Amino acid sequence: MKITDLELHAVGIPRHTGFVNKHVIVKIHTDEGLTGIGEMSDFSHLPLYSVDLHDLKQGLLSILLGQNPFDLMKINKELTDNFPETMYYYEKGSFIRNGIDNALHDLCAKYLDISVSDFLGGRVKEKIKVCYPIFRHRFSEEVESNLDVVRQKLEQGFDVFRLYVGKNLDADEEFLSRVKEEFGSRVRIKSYDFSHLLNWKDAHRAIKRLTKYDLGLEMIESPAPRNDFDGLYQLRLKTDYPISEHVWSFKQQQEMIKKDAIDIFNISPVFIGGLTSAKKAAYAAEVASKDVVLGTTQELSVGTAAMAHLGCSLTNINHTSDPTGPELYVGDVVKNRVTYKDGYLYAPDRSVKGLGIELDESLLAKYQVPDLSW
Amino acid sequence: MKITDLELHAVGIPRHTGFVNKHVIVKIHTDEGLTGIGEMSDFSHLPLYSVDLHDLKQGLLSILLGQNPFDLMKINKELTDNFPETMYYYEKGSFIRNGIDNALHDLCAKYLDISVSDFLGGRVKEKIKVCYPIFRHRFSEEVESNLDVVRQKLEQGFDVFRLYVGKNLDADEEFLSRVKEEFGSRVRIKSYDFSHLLNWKDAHRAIKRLTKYDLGLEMIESPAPRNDFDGLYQLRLKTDYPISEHVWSFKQQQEMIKKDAIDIFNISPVFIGGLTSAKKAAYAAEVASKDVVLGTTQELSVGTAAMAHLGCSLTNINHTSDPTGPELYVGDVVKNRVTYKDGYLYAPDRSVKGLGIELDESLLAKYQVPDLSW
C-alpha cells in the first residue's frame, strides 16, 4: 500500500554481435512486501554521457517514498515534473520514467491478483503481429547475409520483416528483388524505415524507387528528420502508403496531430515514459482517428512484456508492429521469456498476476555490471 | 467474470420546479452474482422521440451477454459500433453508452475490492471545486429571485456560480452589478455560459459588456453555435479569458484540437459515452496541453459519483467545474448521496469498493416510471 524502497540494478547482455547493451532492472518495494518489477532499456544511445545510478536511486526514492502505488496519475505527474519531455527520441529521462511506471503497473496488478492486461482495459486480442528487422545495408555485399536472415527467420515463423533503408539504395533494391524472386508472397517487408536519416525530398526519391517492390508493404517509417513536421506532411501527401513516425513527447505528438502530418503513430512505452504515458498517446491518436503500431526497442522480456499487454488492449492497431528486443540477445534475466510464434508477440498468461514475467536472480547476478558508463 | 443479464429501470424524479426528468438506472449482472450499477440521464432533451427500453435491453444484452466485464476496450468498441457518435450534444446513444460503461467500472472495481477511483489512476485530490447554476434571465424581474439563490446557496457553501446568459443582456449586467455590490469578493461567477445560443460575433459583443464585471471570472462557456469551430477560434483570439466548450464526440474534439479552437475542454461522461471515453477525451486534451473541467448534467448521485472519481484522478483540471445534477432534485434513489461542502464535490469514500454509492430499492420503486416517453 506504501512504497518503501527502490532497487536499480544495471545489467549488460551481450548481443549476437558481442556488443553489450546496458539496461536497468527496477524493483519497487512496499511496506507489505509485494514488489513491482520494471526495465529501463536503451541507455546505449546518444547523448554520450552516463547517468549516476546511485544518485538516480536517491532522487527517485525522494519522489516515491511513502506513496500509494495506485496513485498513478499523481506519481506520473511528479515523474514528468522531475524528468521533463524534450522532443528528443532518446531522452534518458523517458527510459527512467518508463521503468518506474511499468514497475508500478506490475505492483498494482500483483496486489489486485490480476494480470497487467486487466489493469490496461483488458484484451482485444491475445497476440499482435510483429516483424523481424533487417538492418541497413552499406554495401551490396551484405545482401547475401541478409537473405540468409530472411531464410532463417522465415523458418522460425517470421514471415514479415522491416527493412532499414537509406544508405545504399542500389543494395536495397537488389535485396528487395532477391527476396521477391526467392520467397514471393511467402515473405513480406511491411516497412521501409529511414530512421530520420534523409530530408523529406531525398526520402521521397528513395521511396519512389523502393516502392517498385510492394511485398506486402504497409508503411514508410521515419522518412523525415526528427521533428520535421512540415516535411512529414508534404511526404504524407506525396506518398500513397501510410507514413509512420515514433512518438517521443506529447508536444511532438501534438504537433503531428494538429498538422495531420502522419498516418500511423509508432508508440513504445520506453520512448514516451511508460505504459501510462503510452496509453495517453494511443488515446490521443484514437481521438484523432489515427492508427497506432508498437515500435522497436532494445528491451528484454520484462520491458517487451509491457508492450505485449499494451498492444493487446488497443483497438486502433491494424498493422504489423516492431517489438523484437529479445531477438537481439541470446540471454535475458527472466525465468521464462515472452513468446513469439508465427511472427506474433503474445501477451503474457492472463491468469498470472502482474506482468506475467518473473525475474531470475541467478541470471541477474550473471549479467550484472557496476554502472551505465560507456 | 461473465455478464449474464441486464436491468434497465426508468425513474422520474420531480425537480424543484415540479417538472420530472427521466433517468434509467442500470444493473449489469454476472454469473458470480456481483452487480455493477450505472445511470443513463439527460433523456429529457431533443430530439423529441423516446427510446423503447424493452428493445434497448435486448440489443444491449446481445452485445454484453457472456463477456468479461474487464474487457473494457473491447466492449466500448462494440458499444461505439452500435451507438455511433454523431457530433450532436444530446445524442441519446451517448447516455446509453455512458450508463453501461460506468456500470462496468463499478462492477470491475467491486470485483477487485477497490474504489472506482483506484481503477481510474488513483487520486490527485479528494474533491474538485464546483459552481452553482443561475439560469438565464428573460426579464429583469427574475433578478431579485436569482439574488436570493446566490444568497441562499452562498449560505450553504456555494461561493462560486455559473451564469447562463445571452437572452436579456441588460438583465444580466443588473444581476452582475447587484451581486458585486452586495457580496463583493464573497461570491464568484466563474463563467458566462451562452449555451450555443449566439453566433460568435453576437457573443463577442455580449462578452465585452459582461466582462466589465470580473467577479472571479474563469472562462466563457459555449460562446458559439454547436460545431462552429472557426467561430470558436476567432472568439478565442478576441477574448482575453479562456474559452470553454463541451466535448460530445471525438470527431468534434479532434476538430477543436486541430484548430486550437478553445482553451478548456468541458467533459462529462454522459455526453461522451462514459468514463472510458471521458478518460480518452481528457488524455487527448492533456496531450494537446489543454485544460479540462467537468461539465453539468442532470445526473443523480450515481452518475455524479462517476464524475467525482474522474475529476479527482485528472492532472489537468485547474478551474472550477459544473456537476450539480443532484441540486436539481429533492430526492434520489441511493442510500447516501454524493457530498458537496464549501462548494466542492467530494469523491466517494475510497475505502468503499465500487462506485461508493449504493442504490435504495425502496426509492427506486417510489420513483419508477413505465417508460421514457415525453
Q: What is the DSSP string of B143-212?
A: HHHHHHHHHHHHHTT--EEEEE-SS-HHHHHHHHHHHHHHHGGG-EEEEEE-TT-S-HHHHHHHHHHHTT
Active site residue A344: no
Q: Is 3.30.390.10 the CATH number for B1-122+349-368?
A: yes
Q: Is B248 on the interface with A (CB under 8 A)?
A: no
Q: Is A87 on the interface with B (CB under 8 A)?
A: no
Closest CA of chain B from A45, distance in Å: 26
Q: Residue A68 class from Cβ within 10 Å (0-12 exposed, 13-18 middle, 19+ buried)? A: middle
Q: What CA dihedral angle connects A166, A172, A173 and A177, to 10 degrees?
A: -150
Class of domain B123-348: alpha beta
Q: What is the three-class DSSP state of A8? A: strand
Q: Provide the 10 A C-beta neighbour count for residue B356.
A: 23
Q: Is B15 on the interface with A (CB under 8 A)?
A: no
Q: Among residues A258, A232, A235, which one has the least CA distance to residue A245?
A: A232
Q: Among residues B132, B148, B137, B198, which one has the least CA distance to residue B173?
A: B137
Classify A223 in phi/psi space as left (phi over 0), alpha (psi -120 to 50) or beta. Answer: alpha
B25 DSSP β-pair partners: B9, B39
Sequence ranges of the domains in chain B = 1-122+349-368, 123-348
Q: Among residues A20, A39, A8, A93, which one has the least CA distance to residue A373?
A: A20
Distance between CA atoms of residues B135 and B152, nearest Å:
15
Element (H, E) at B260: none
Distance between CA atoms of residues B372 and B374, nearest Å:
7
Catalytic residues of B: 90, 164
Element (H, E) at A212: none
Active site residue A192: no
Distance between CA atoms of residues B57 and B71, nearest Å:
20
Element (H, E) at A297: none
Method: X-ray
Chain A residue closest to B124 (CA)? Answer: A74
Distance between CA atoms of residues B52 and B122, nearest Å:
37
Q: Among residues B66, B34, B101, which one has the least CA distance to residue B281?
A: B101
Q: Is B330 on the interface with A (CB under 8 A)?
A: no
Instruction: Name residues whose C-beta falls within 8 Å of residue A250's C-beta, 6 or more positions apart in sequence.
Output: A85, A272, A277, A280, A281, A284, B286, B287, B289
B293 DSSP β-pair partners: B266
Which chain B residues in 249-288 lie under 8 Å from chain A, judged by CB atoms? 250-251, 253-254, 257-258, 260, 276, 279-281, 283-284, 286-288
Grid coordinates in use for B97?
A: 453508452
Closest CA of chain A from B107, distance in Å: 13
Helix, strand, coil shares of chain A, percent, nearest 5, are 40, 20, 40
Of the candidates B74, B289, B315, which has its C-beta nearest A124's C-beta? B74
Q: Is A81 on the interface with B (CB under 8 A)?
A: no
A287 and B250 within 8 Å at the Cβ level: the answer is yes
Binding residue ranges of B for Mg(2+): 42, 45, 193, 221, 246, 297
Closest CA of chain B from A145, distance in Å: 43
Q: Is A73 on the interface with B (CB under 8 A)?
A: yes
> Is A35 a known ligand-binding residue?
no
Helix then strand count (H, E) for chain A reads 13, 13
Distance between CA atoms of residues B363 and B366, nearest Å:
5
Residues followed by a break in chain A, C–N over 2.5 Å?
none
Chain A with chain B: Cβ pairs closer than 8 A: 101
Beta strands in chain A (DSSP E): 3-14, 20-30, 35-40, 127-129, 132-134, 160-164, 188-193, 219-221, 243-246, 264-267, 291-294, 340-341, 344-346
Q: Among residues A324, A326, A18, which one has the least CA distance to residue A164?
A: A324
Closest CA of chain A from B111, distance in Å: 10
Q: Provide the 10 A C-beta neighbour count for residue B31.
A: 11
What is the resolution in angstroms?
A: 1.6
Q: Residue A12 class from Cβ within 10 Å (0-12 exposed, 13-18 middle, 19+ buried)? A: middle
Buried-state track A86-97, b at ≥16 Cβ within 10 A, e below 16: eebbbbbbbbbb
Q: Provide the 10 A C-beta neighbour count for residue A84.
A: 10
